[PDB]
Design a protein around this ligand. Structure first.
Ligand SMILES: [Mg+2]
Ligand SMILES: [Mg+2]
Ligand SMILES: [Mg+2]
Ligand SMILES: [Mg+2]
Ligand SMILES: [Mg+2]
Ligand SMILES: [Mg+2]
Ligand SMILES: [Mg+2]
Ligand SMILES: [Mg+2]
Ligand SMILES: [Mg+2]
Ligand SMILES: [Mg+2]
Ligand SMILES: [Mg+2]
Ligand SMILES: [Mg+2]
Ligand SMILES: [Mg+2]
Ligand SMILES: [Mg+2]
Ligand SMILES: [Mg+2]
Ligand SMILES: [Mg+2]
Ligand SMILES: [Mg+2]
Ligand SMILES: [Mg+2]
Ligand SMILES: [Mg+2]
Ligand SMILES: [Mg+2]
Ligand SMILES: [Mg+2]
Ligand SMILES: [Mg+2]
Ligand SMILES: [Mg+2]
Ligand SMILES: [Mg+2]
Ligand SMILES: [Mg+2]
Ligand SMILES: [Mg+2]
Ligand SMILES: [Mg+2]
Ligand SMILES: [Mg+2]
Ligand SMILES: [Mg+2]
Ligand SMILES: [Mg+2]
Ligand SMILES: [Mg+2]
Ligand SMILES: [Mg+2]
Ligand SMILES: [Mg+2]
Ligand SMILES: [Mg+2]
Ligand SMILES: [Mg+2]
Ligand SMILES: [Mg+2]
Ligand SMILES: [Mg+2]
Ligand SMILES: [Mg+2]
Ligand SMILES: [Mg+2]
Ligand SMILES: [Mg+2]
Ligand SMILES: [Zn+2]
Lengths: 141, 130, 184, 37
RNA sequence: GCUGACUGGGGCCUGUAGAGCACUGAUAGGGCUAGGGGGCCCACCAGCCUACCAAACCCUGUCAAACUCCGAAGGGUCCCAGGUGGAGCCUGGGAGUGAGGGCGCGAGCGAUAACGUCCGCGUCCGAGCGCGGGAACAACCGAGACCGCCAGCUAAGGCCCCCAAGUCUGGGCUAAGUGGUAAAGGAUGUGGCGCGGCGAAGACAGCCAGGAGGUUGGCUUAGAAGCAGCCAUCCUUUAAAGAGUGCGUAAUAGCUCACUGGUCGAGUGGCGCCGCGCCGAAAAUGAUCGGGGCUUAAGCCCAGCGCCGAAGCUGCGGGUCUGG
RNA sequence: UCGCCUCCUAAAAGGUAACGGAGGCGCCCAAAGGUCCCCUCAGGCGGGACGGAAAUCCGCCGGAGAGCGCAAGGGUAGAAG
RNA sequence: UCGAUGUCGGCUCGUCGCAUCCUGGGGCUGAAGAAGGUCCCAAGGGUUGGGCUGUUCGCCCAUUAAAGCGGCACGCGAGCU
């Protein structure tokens, strides 16, 4: 999958999901990008499932830029166990994405391709998405 | 009207040497007969007697922006203008007169011509060959 | 590129937009006024104007002063403009972003790879009067390996730069085909 | 391809109709025939 | 005996929200560059190349309860002021209580499941299962019931009948009974904004004609002729016709659409939004939004006048507890 | 699991729970105490006999990242080292 | 609900759901026909007898148009066992 190589703490509280995006709202790298429209924990297996979908659509071509990173520990208690006895074990890792974050984005591929490519990856994600392309993203001078 | 602008501009410039500007019939041909008709007074008149077709609309505006109305007898419908800036006007016609009678079409298909300014006629085309 | 502006006294910015306008501001050494522009109209300009070309504003005083966007703040969600910063041009030397027009088919593409345009601009200081349009760039020749950058561009008359200039501006990276899964 | 939740066109000769209050996909080639359910 | 809660003005104490990487760690790509596969290798003296691995470091993008260069709102406390309250403070007598619960918000746990669980502030129930609304219903909305009245104004919620009061007045929306409660996801459902593109030098649809020569473009174990992956990525005679839009041959053939001629001779296709609706939608005794029923509404949205409506508030009479 | 210490959870005073998250203590020092006087680190880059990539040296550059008996935090070179 | 709500399986007796096993309608089929597959509509009525195990369940035997899956305090002990 995709996950941190080291850590200071193996497990962490759940935290909340209010707010916009904090950052990562403009294209920055490629020509097109997939933006999140709802709050959600995107799991490593979801990210992978999307990325492969990408590389799979446009076989041998362009560059894909995964911009979200699963570094937050997802926990789960053993099958059929009661409440108590301490915190559960790490089942996987997630990426906390809030409305507006540009999760993925492609480069070096025909427009038509960028579309169907990003559309598919959307389906793999557990939230509503929107495709876009460089615009007022030139945050400069 | 951005591409049609160049179209008319070109028709006019070409409509300059008005010596054999004629318009007749023998249509409904294939693409194989394309290079055919396009060989009449081109193998005796050279790059002087050619056959170019364009929008009737844009064509009827050309004749206005440079006197040559009277094309009322012949105007409506799908038409072609066998422009001949050089090479015998009556000779470049003695061609379009045969190929037509050859491609299987009665001696009835000639919609007037303008020889160096002069409204020809219908039957006045069956003679421009003989 | 003509874009009209209007003055703002000091009434709820939330209203301006809940209307159809886009609040903003004008400034440089001297002068700094709260202004605004029609949203749907400012967008049509910026789409091409961007921050690479000078946006000539106006006002009631019929004073068409030249400027260029210093920064546009977005809405994060809804992702649309929410405020603009207009920099009024003078005669003084100013630093701006001039678009890099990478022209040519890099040998690395036909071969194997994608032209990742690391930097589609480059802040450079210059004279308002003398503002370039686009700094062309020689891309052909770049193979799969590393790629040209920063200190490798034809800097027009009176236009140096505020870069490293080691800052890589482009690089050809091999393409991604098949064969995946490394964690067996 | 008959009764699904996602009814689209599949091919240039497929036309999206709507009768009996439902969305049907009508087309020359019988397979593409769809509904919604 | 004015010091109370609460409040105004000062002074600081602080590190949450947020944000941000300067610290501690986590981070994707790129550059540069110790190494190490290894590579041309003139062979020890270095060396050169590398769409692999890859430090440190810089650039672009980010991440944190146990990160913080930074940092609110607020909160705490002291001082000066308001504040006469079943306020406070001091001493003593009598206790009961030490199973709490729901709701909101901030965290943990949980699986951001539970009429779950554990803390934090608040609030109600508890003890207000007294009253009005919510069909019914401890804790949702309204409101703190001393007693009496065949008087009055209101609250929430209502004003077609059940059922007290508008079948009220203007502008819209919906056509499903949506309203009367589910998602991703679909769709020429309706209505309204946009912004571009084409069109009376004739667009859009339909119809009529053409839709060609380079040649079956090169490349494939069978073959691949416009229709499996690439280079060059173009030419020709042209009104206009691709090294081709689907259908289709084993492959050709065939039928098509890209484009334009021409009739016709007024608008017409593209996408981005917003409102309300359609499908998506299967569970167990008999059904229904509480019922009847309701469609320019008796639904939804937005203005307005007016009424109904509690044990709340007035009016009238009475009792009682404090203080003066 | 049961007492004690550090950090978080703890909602920027204090306090605050759960079989919540993550680590320590049940010692030690006669110098690791008192006072007086001096001294300033870690690393980075050079240059260096054996010298790993830190032995000890030399030269710049370096406000603290070193050190402070042991956990963690706070603190600290204008010293607590 | 612990000042008591008898607990598995069978028997008996039904009744309901539909996410349909058969039967009836129908679309697509890689549907020639016949026989299938799949999806949509549809419970009106049907949905066998045995061997083994307390069994539910399953595995077999022999048939069948079919030998459906679930609910009713895992229906039914003031009805039986
Ligand atoms: Mg006082
Ligand atoms: Mg006080
Ligand atoms: Mg105060
Ligand atoms: Mg913090
Ligand atoms: Mg935060
Ligand atoms: Mg204060
Ligand atoms: Mg009291
Ligand atoms: Mg007492
Ligand atoms: Mg207790
Ligand atoms: Mg309890
Ligand atoms: Mg308790
Ligand atoms: Mg309480
Ligand atoms: Mg409690
Ligand atoms: Mg409480
Ligand atoms: Mg909870
Ligand atoms: Mg509870
Ligand atoms: Mg709860
Ligand atoms: Mg407790
Ligand atoms: Mg109370
Ligand atoms: Mg009550
Ligand atoms: Mg009761
Ligand atoms: Mg009540
Ligand atoms: Mg009630
Ligand atoms: Mg009272
Ligand atoms: Mg009244
Ligand atoms: Mg009211
Ligand atoms: Mg009434
Ligand atoms: Mg719905
Ligand atoms: Mg939806
Ligand atoms: Mg109305
Ligand atoms: Mg009263
Ligand atoms: Mg009294
Ligand atoms: Mg605290
Ligand atoms: Mg606090
Ligand atoms: Mg000493
Ligand atoms: Mg009893
Ligand atoms: Mg059914
Ligand atoms: Mg059959
Ligand atoms: Mg049954
Ligand atoms: Mg019984
Ligand atoms: Zn079809």
């Amino acid at each position: 999958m995709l996950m941190p190589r080291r850590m200071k703490y193996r497990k962490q509280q759940r935290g909340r999901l209010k707010g916009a995006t904090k950052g990562g709202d403009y294209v920055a790298f490629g020509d097109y990008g997939l933006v999140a429209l709802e709050p959600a924990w995107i799991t490593a297996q979801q990210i992978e499932a999307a990325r492969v979908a990408m590389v799979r659509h446009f076989r041998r071509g362009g560059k894909i830029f995964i911009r979200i990173f699963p570094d937050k520990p997802y926990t789960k208690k053993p099958l059929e166990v009661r409440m108590g006895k301490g915190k559960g074990n790490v089942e996987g890792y997630v990426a906390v994405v809030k409305p507006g974050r540009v999760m993925f984005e492609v480069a070096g591929v025909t427009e038509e391709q960028a579309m169907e490519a990003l559309r598919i990856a959307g389906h793999k994600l557990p939230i509503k998405t929107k495709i876009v392309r460089r615009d007022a993203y030139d945050e400069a001078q | 009207x951005x591409x049609x602008x160049x179209x008319x501009x070109x028709x006019x410039x070409x409509x300059x040497x008005x010596x054999x500007x004629x318009x007749x019939x023998x249509x409904x041909x294939x693409x194989x007969x394309x290079x055919x008709x396009x060989x009449x007074x081109x193998x005796x008149x050279x790059x002087x007697x050619x056959x170019x077709x364009x929008x009737x609309x844009x064509x009827x505006x050309x004749x206005x922006x440079x006197x040559x109305x009277x094309x009322x007898x012949x105007x409506x419908x799908x038409x072609x203008x066998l422009x001949x800036x050089x090479x015998x006007x009556x000779x470049x016609x003695x061609x379009x007169x045969x190929x037509x009678x050859x491609x299987x079409x009665x001696x009835x298909x000639x919609x007037x011509x303008x020889x160096x300014x002069x409204x020809x006629x219908x039957x006045x085309x069956x003679x421009x060959x003989x | 590129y003509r874009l009209k502006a209007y003055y703002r006294e000091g009434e709820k910015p939330s209203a301006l937009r809940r209307a159809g306008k886009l609040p903003g501001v004008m400034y440089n050494r001297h002068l700094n006024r709260k202004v605004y522009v029609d949203l749907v109209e400012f967008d049509k300009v910026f789409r091409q104007a961007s921050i690479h070309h000078v946006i000539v504003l106006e006002l009631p005083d019929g004073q068409s002063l030249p400027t260029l966007v210093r920064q546009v703040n977005l809405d994060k969600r809804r992702r649309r403009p929410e405020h603009v910063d207009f920099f009024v041009l003078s005669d003084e030397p100013v630093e701006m972003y001039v678009p890099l027009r990478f022209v040519g088919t890099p040998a690395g593409v036909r071969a194997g790879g994608v032209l990742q345009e690391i930097h589609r601009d480059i802040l450079v200081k210059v004279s308002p009067r003398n503002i370039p349009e686009f700094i062309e760039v020689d891309v052909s020749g770049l193979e799969i390996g590393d790629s040209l950058h920063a200190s490798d561009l034809k800097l027009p008359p009176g236009v140096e730069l505020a870069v490293s200039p080691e800052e890589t501006i482009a690089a050809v990276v091999p393409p991604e085909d098949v064969e995946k899964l490394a964690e067996e | 391809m008959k009764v699904r939740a996602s009814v689209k066109r599949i091919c240039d000769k497929c036309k999206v109709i709507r009768r009996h209050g439902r969305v049907y996909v009508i087309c020359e080639n019988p397979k593409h025939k769809q509904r919604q359910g």
